[PDB]
Amino acid sequence: VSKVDLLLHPELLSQEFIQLMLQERNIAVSDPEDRDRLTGLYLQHVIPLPQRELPRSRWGKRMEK
Amino acid sequence: MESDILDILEQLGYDGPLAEEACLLAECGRGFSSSEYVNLLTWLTKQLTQFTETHTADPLDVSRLLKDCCCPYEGLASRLANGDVKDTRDHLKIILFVSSELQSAQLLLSKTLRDAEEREMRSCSPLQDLSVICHTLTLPDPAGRDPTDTFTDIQTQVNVLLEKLPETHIGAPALQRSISAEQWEELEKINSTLSAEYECRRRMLIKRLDVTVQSFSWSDRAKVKIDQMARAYQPKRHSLSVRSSVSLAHLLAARRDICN
Amino acid sequence: RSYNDELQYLDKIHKNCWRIKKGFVPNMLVEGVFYVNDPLEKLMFEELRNACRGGFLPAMKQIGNVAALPGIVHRSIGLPDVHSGYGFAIGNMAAFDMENPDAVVSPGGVGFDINCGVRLLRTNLDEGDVQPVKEQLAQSLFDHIPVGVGSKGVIPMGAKDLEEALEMGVDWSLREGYAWAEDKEHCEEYGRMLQADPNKVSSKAKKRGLPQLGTLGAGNHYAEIQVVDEIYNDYAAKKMGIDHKGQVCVMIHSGSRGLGHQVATDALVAMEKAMKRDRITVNDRQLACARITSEEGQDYLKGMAAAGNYAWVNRSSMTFLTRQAFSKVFSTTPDDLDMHVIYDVSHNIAKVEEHMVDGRQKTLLVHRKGSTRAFPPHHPLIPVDYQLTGQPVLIGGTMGTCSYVLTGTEQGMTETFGTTCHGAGRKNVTDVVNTCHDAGISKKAIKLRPIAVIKG
Amino acid sequence: MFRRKLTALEYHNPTGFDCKDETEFRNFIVWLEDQKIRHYKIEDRGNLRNIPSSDWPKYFEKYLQDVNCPFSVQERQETVDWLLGLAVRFEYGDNVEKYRNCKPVNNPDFKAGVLALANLLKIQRHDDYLVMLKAIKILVQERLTPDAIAKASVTLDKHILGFDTGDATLNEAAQILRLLHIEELRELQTKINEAIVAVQAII
Amino acid sequence: DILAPTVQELANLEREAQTSFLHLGYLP
């Protein structure tokens, strides 16, 4: 419960913690001083997303049943 | 694996008799003997060869494509070339692989085209402004056209909506007095310092929002409703920007209504 | 001292500004001033003459004693409603520079009732619409809001809820759903104080103030409803959301209940002991002062911040209760009624501002007892609506006289550190408002007249 | 190998991916689960998120069985390809029509026209021939739009500039710039209020 | 550290905004 709350808010994370996550996931980092690039990379690759709604295809119908 | 292949075919769109699971299973069990199978393989492989940089469903050609397209299935290429394998599972696997590769190639090409057009838009050129005006005034795209022709077109277009609306709609400019070229450097400096100060103010506002949402996140219900909070907060929050977009063009285009 | 020997120490700068030079009281550090018109001069001078001819010092002498504490910069200021009170005079203003280690805080400077203030709500109805159901509305407001000594808040609370409210403030009230997102915008300090520690509050205060939340209390606290009477600034009134006369508004005047008083007393009892070690002597034993960089000073600052957050939570809860009552009476959603909040000012808080003195920037901790903060237009701590007209200042009076809505000015920011009056005090509210307007420290925009008042 | 499929899904290391690695495979699996598939909730993925534990493969089997994948981890490459195809299919099911049709395959009169257009729309002349063109762009976008045409049917000195540059004509421009900046800041504040309301509506 | 001090840096931002506001139009 703590880890998901930590990963879902890049705004409150420290610079060092964001850099540690980016290095742990083996993500290439350029201009590490700038916060904007680090936040962009974190939002593009690391942040989780909510559950996707069931697709209209047959797989979604099978999953619903 | 029948469901996955049927879903892929429905996504790609097929008018053949493959919409029935039983017919597809029977055709796959038949193997390369069915003309439907070879026709479908040719239909997929022509587009797959068109999409790949290196540019008849005989086993040799499709096996060569599998070798070229970095097909990762264990022994599929060699066994397909030899023809020893006749199991229907191999047929399902090869159909699935080729269809998924075609779908991925289409997605890659579409994303590359979108990125290229976005990069072209990013350039600070009159073309972006002209395209914006033409799109918002239902006019043909001026790109690739004579500039005088497009200018006359937009000129003639503007009046037909000018008189339809009341005259007191556009209004008079708020910047009434004439400004010489000497004062423009000082005006630019004033705009720059104002922009810096208001950027700082905007950043402080965004940080206040950050603190408020952090205080929110410690609620007891905040630990059980993570999905809804993420879905309703991430896209709203990650669209705000600290940069101030006011420029001298806004000053020139400002009308008397903003100065009331 | 002789009366003429006393009055030899007073002079005038201009029509609406006197001046008390050094020597009025021992060990002064800078001259004092006060803003009074002709009617106010008579009252002040009669008080001084009678004092020179009771156990309470005169207002001018209390200004003088305040003008001697270490670290004080610029001049001691007496707003047109200044009158005698415990420690600092009621309506007296003083700012201390944090850079000087000799600077001190004062529990009496902030006040016993920490962070009591006025919040205004606008409503799109008219006087002729409320009047037919005026009695029903008054009864519903009286029954819905628990007002009186010993009354308990209708909504429940516990130790965890109280601790969270002390830590956060309006954020807690807005998270539970008691206040909209707009309420946090139109609040001084944006509704909460950044530095605050609930564990710096004595547990006795927390125990005492647990059932007191949402309760108006006795004294000058009320939740009255009134009608707009006149508009002096059309642009300011339009910005505030009041365009035509006859509009309905509701002001809630409320304090910190028992947390503020208990924090003040528990800080004073230790501050007096710390004074002996700190080697600080002043004219009056009631002027408690210890260094800013001290355990007692920091503890009092944190306790006062927690009391302010509690008072803001109480005011937000009162706003929610009033909104619910109005919605139930008029059978309409409160958002449709446009029951927003114009502003929320606090006149019993000391805050760390960044005024400019003698052309040199300085970070000043400012005590404001009985006086309301005002800021000039374009200040970066005012809502976006009021960035062109200046911060609203609401003169919360009592039953009878009409409350006022002034706005700050550029002159007041550089002259009186952006501070204006906060009521008549223990005088005429109209005279005080006129004195503030003529002195260049405010300008009136709306005048509101009461119809119904809810007291205890 | 998996290069095109990963690139279509916008992977951060399209080339450096290796299927046979131990930790990096789990990192990729968790990235695909929380980014390109999104089956469960964020909080439920915790057991799958824990990378270095020795009990992780059991949760991997549970995840593979839940999505009803025809294969298992006995063939790691098989499941990698199937999951990549599933993610690409999920991305495909947004706009089928547009994705199906993809197939690889200082002038004086300009300045005169811009000047005429600016004169028609009451825009003051400027030294640079591109600034007033941007002015026409903003004006047309703000006023010549379907919403504005559908909705078609205090003095300047009364405001406070907050300072004084000492000029009589630059003061008006400073006031206008201040008003524009205030309007942008108000727009940002409105968005912030909307976000706070949306978040608090859940609780 | 796993978390950053947000309230302190918010106070710093507010102070910086006040300094900029004073420097713009109150400089003698």
Identify all chain B residues contacting C190, using CB atoms and an 8 Å cutoff.
Answer: 208
Residue A11 and residue B237: Cβ atoms within 8 Å? yes
Residue type, B168: T
Contact C162, C209 (CB under 8 A): yes
Helix (H, G, I), strand (E, B) or coil at C44: helix
Rounded CA-CA distance B48/D4 in Å is: 12
DSSP string, C190-240: GGS-SS--GGGS-HHHHHHHSTTTT---SSS-B--EEEEEEES-HHHHHHH
- In three state form, how does the secondary structure of chain B look? CHHHHHHHHHHHCCCCHHHCHHHHHHHHHHCCCCHHHHHHHHHHHHHHHHHCCCCCCCHHHHHHHHHHCCCCCCCHHHHHHHCCCCCHHHHHHHHHHHHHHHHHHHHHHHHHHHHHHHHHHHCCCHHHHHHHHHHHCCCCCCCCCCHHHHHHHHHHHHHHHHCCCCCCCCCCECCCCCCCHHHHHHHHHHHHHHHHHHHHHHHHHHHHHHHHHHHHCCCCHHHCCHHHHHHHHHHHHCCCCCCCCCCHHHHHHCECCCCC
Helix (H, G, I), strand (E, B) or coil at B260: coil
**H or E segment at C367?**
strand C364-368
Contact B5, A59 (CB under 8 A): no
Contact A21, D8 (CB under 8 A): no
Bridge-based pairing state of the strands C104-105 and C290-291: antiparallel
Q: Is D140 found in the same domain as D77?
A: no
Rounded CA-CA distance D79/D33 in Å is: 13
Rounded CA-CA distance D82/D94 in Å is: 20
Rounded CA-CA distance B194/C23 in Å is: 47
Helix (H, G, I), strand (E, B) or coil at C253: strand
Q: Is D59 found in the same domain as D123?
A: no
CA distance B145 to chain C (A): 46
Phi/psi of residue C64, each to 5°? Answer: -65, -45
Rounded CA-CA distance E28/E26 in Å is: 6
Task: List residues in chain C touching E: CB distance below 8 A.
Answer: 194-195, 353-354, 356, 359, 361, 363, 378-381, 414
Rounded CA-CA distance C365/C351 in Å is: 6
- In the numeric block, which tokens belong to residue D81? 């390809």
Contact B136, D141 (CB under 8 A): yes
Question: Residue B85: which of D96, B93, D100 has the closest Cα?
Answer: B93
The domain locations on chain C are: 117-452
Burial category of C143 from C-beta neighbours within 10 Å (exposed 0-12, middle 13-18, buried 19 and up): exposed
Rounded CA-CA distance D113/B160 in Å is: 18
Rounded CA-CA distance C245/A44 in Å is: 54
How far is it between the farthest Cα atoms of chain B? 88
Rounded CA-CA distance A1/B229 in Å is: 14
Helix (H, G, I), strand (E, B) or coil at C11: strand
Rounded CA-CA distance B259/D157 in Å is: 9
Q: Any idea which residue has 């006087």 for tokens? A: C127
Q: Which residues contact B71 (CB under 8 A, 6 or more apart)?
A: B77, B97
Q: Is D76 found in the same domain as D144?
A: no
C249 is in an annotated binding site: no
Q: Is B23 found in the same domain as B96?
A: yes
Q: Is B14 found in the same domain as B84?
A: yes
Phi/psi of residue C395, each to 5°? Answer: -95, 90
Contact B208/C at CB under 8 A: yes
Solving technique: cryo-EM
**H or E segment at B193?**
helix B181-216
Bridge-based pairing state of the strands C10-14 and C17-20: antiparallel
Rounded CA-CA distance A16/C235 in Å is: 49
Q: Is D41 found in the same domain as D119?
A: no
Rounded CA-CA distance D50/D27 in Å is: 10
Contact C18, C12 (CB under 8 A): yes
Contact C371, C417 (CB under 8 A): no
Output the CA torsion sign for C421, C427, C430, C434: negative
For helices D170-202 and B181-216, angle between their N-to-C axes, nearest 10 degrees: 20
Find residue C222's DSSP bridge partners.
Answer: C253
Q: Any idea which residue has 């208001």 for tokens? A: B198
CATH number of the domain at C117-452, out of 3.40.50.300, 3.40.50.10860, 3.30.70.340, 3.90.1860.10? 3.90.1860.10
Contact D81, B100 (CB under 8 A): yes
Rounded CA-CA distance C397/C433 in Å is: 12
Q: Do chains D and B touch (3 or more CB pairs under 8 A)?
A: yes
CB atoms within 10 A of CB D88: 25
C399 is in an annotated binding site: yes
Q: Suggest the residue from E9, E13, E26 to mutate for an interface test with chain C (most C CBs closer than 10 A).
A: E26
DSSP E strand boundaries for C66-188: 76-83, 90-97, 104-105, 117-126
Output the CA torsion sign for C130, C136, C139, C142: negative
Phi/psi of residue B188, each to 5°? Answer: -65, -40
Sheet containing C247-254: order of strands = C341-346, C117-126, C247-254, C225-231, C443-452, C403-407, C392-395
Contact D12/B at CB under 8 A: no
Burial category of C290 from C-beta neighbours within 10 Å (exposed 0-12, middle 13-18, buried 19 and up): buried
Helix (H, G, I), strand (E, B) or coil at C250: strand
Rounded CA-CA distance D149/B185 in Å is: 37
Helix (H, G, I), strand (E, B) or coil at D154: coil
**H or E segment at B160?**
helix B147-162
Rounded CA-CA distance B241/D192 in Å is: 11
Contact C361, E19 (CB under 8 A): yes
Contact C140, C325 (CB under 8 A): yes
Q: Is B8 found in the same domain as B83?
A: yes
How far is it between the farthest Cα atoms of chain A? 50
Q: Chain centroid to CA B254: how far?
A: 33
Last residue of a domain, one of B86, B119, B152: B119
Nearest CB among B72, B113, B170 relative to D143 is that of B170
Residue D90 and residue A44: Cβ atoms within 8 Å? no
- In the numeric block, which tokens belong to residue B208? 């206040």
Q: Count CA atoms closer than 13 A to B243's CA, side-chain side.
A: 4
Identify all chain A residues contacting D31, using CB atoms and an 8 Å cutoff.
Answer: 25, 45
- In the numeric block, which tokens belong to residue C93? 């203003």
Residue type, D122: K
The number of folded domains in chain B is 3
Bridge-based pairing state of the strands C392-395 and C403-407: antiparallel
Contact C348, C366 (CB under 8 A): no
How far is it between the farthest Cα atoms of chain D? 81
Rounded CA-CA distance D60/D79 in Å is: 11
C425 is in an annotated binding site: yes
Contact C6, C48 (CB under 8 A): yes
Chains within contact range of chain C (3+ C-beta pairs < 8 Å) = B, D, E
Rounded CA-CA distance C386/C378 in Å is: 8
Question: Residue C150: which of C297, C277, C20, C258 has the closest Cα?
Answer: C258
Residue E9 and residue B196: Cβ atoms within 8 Å? no
Question: Residue B106: which of D7, D31, D11 has the closest Cα?
Answer: D7
Question: Residue C266: which of C209, C207, C202 has the closest Cα?
Answer: C202
- Structural domain harbouring B83: 2-119
Contact B234/A at CB under 8 A: yes
List the end-to-end C-alpha distance of chain D, in Å, as a whole number: 46
DSSP string, C374-389: ---TT-TTS-STTTTT
CA–CA distance from D137 to each of B164, B256, D173 (Å)? 20, 17, 20
Rounded CA-CA distance C287/C303 in Å is: 19
Bridge-based pairing state of the strands C443-452 and C403-407: antiparallel
Question: Residue D1: which of D88, D91, D80 has the closest Cα?
Answer: D80
Find residue C252's DSSP bridge partners.
Answer: C119
Question: Residue C345: which of C372, C368, C306 has the closest Cα?
Answer: C372
Find residue C345's DSSP bridge partners.
Answer: C118
Q: Chain centroid to CA E23: how far?
A: 13
Q: Any idea which residue has 């004033």 for tokens? A: B190
- In the numeric block, which tokens belong to residue B86? 């006749």
Contact C416, C93 (CB under 8 A): yes
Last residue of a domain, one of D100, D120, D145: D100
Helix (H, G, I), strand (E, B) or coil at C106: coil
Phi/psi of residue B73, each to 5°? Answer: -70, 135
- Structural domain harbouring D171: 156-203
Q: Is D96 found in the same domain as D8?
A: yes
Resolution in A: 3.3
Question: Residue B198: which of B247, B238, B239 has the closest Cα?
Answer: B247
Rounded CA-CA distance C420/C408 in Å is: 8
CB atoms within 10 A of CB C193: 21
Rounded CA-CA distance D137/B253 in Å is: 9
Sheet containing C10-14: order of strands = C10-14, C17-20, C32-34, C76-83, C90-97, C364-368, C351-353
- Structural domain harbouring A60: 2-64
Phi/psi of residue B249, each to 5°? Answer: -60, -40
Question: Residue B41: which of B7, B85, B91, B84 has the closest Cα?
Answer: B91
Contact C387, D181 (CB under 8 A): no
Contact C318, C254 (CB under 8 A): yes
Q: Which residues contact D179 (CB under 8 A, 6 or more apart)?
A: B254, B258, B259, D159
Q: Chain centroid to CA D177: how far?
A: 28
Residue B204 and residue C380: Cβ atoms within 8 Å? yes
Helix (H, G, I), strand (E, B) or coil at B258: coil
The number of folded domains in chain D is 3
Torsional class of B85: left (φ above 0), alpha (ψ -120 to 50), beta (otherwise) = beta
Rounded CA-CA distance D79/D70 in Å is: 9
Identify all chain C residues contacting D193, using CB atoms and an 8 Å cutoff.
Answer: 181-182, 185
Rounded CA-CA distance B156/C200 in Å is: 73
